[PDB]
């Protein structure tokens, strides 16, 4: 009877597999490719300036 | 890379003030120097101001 952390490896593999499934689904439906027509909108984001003192 | 876009239009109303550029159709430009009241105007003999 030596020491044992097989349940630790199973738990860590379960965490890795569940996180890989969720992140694969999110990176599947957020960086998809639009088809035959192109990007149907535009980003249009612009940043203006401010008056920032320097004390 | 983008999830959703919100587009917001705005509308604003600009009156006139000393500094704007008005000009006829014959090439005679100008910047509005002062903005006088009514009673400091040259009126004719009938009373109507200019």
Curated annotation (Swiss-Prot), chain A:
GO terms for biological process: DNA-templated transcription termination; regulation of DNA-templated transcription elongation; regulation of transcription by RNA polymerase II; transcription antitermination. GO terms for molecular function: bacterial-type RNA polymerase core enzyme binding; DNA binding; RNA binding; RNA polymerase binding; RNA stem-loop binding; single-stranded RNA binding; transcription antitermination factor activity, RNA binding. Keywords: DNA-binding, Transcription, Transcription regulation, Transcription termination. Residues 33-55 are annotated as: Disordered. Interacts with host nusA. Plays a role as a transcriptional antitermination factor that allows the virus to initiate its lytic phase. Activates expression of the delayed viral early genes by modifying host RNA polymerase (RNAP) into a form that is resistant to termination signals. This antitermination function requires the host NusA protein which serves to stabilize the interaction between antitermination protein N and host RNA polymerase. This is Antitermination protein N. The gene is N.
Curated annotation (Swiss-Prot), chain B:
It comes from the Bacteria. This is DNA-directed RNA polymerase subunit beta. Disulfide bonds: none annotated. DNA-dependent RNA polymerase catalyzes the transcription of DNA into RNA using the four ribonucleoside triphosphates as substrates. It comes from Escherichia coli O157:H7. Belongs to the RNA polymerase beta chain family. The RNAP catalytic core consists of 2 alpha, 1 beta, 1 beta' and 1 omega subunit. When a sigma factor is associated with the core the holoenzyme is formed, which can initiate transcription.
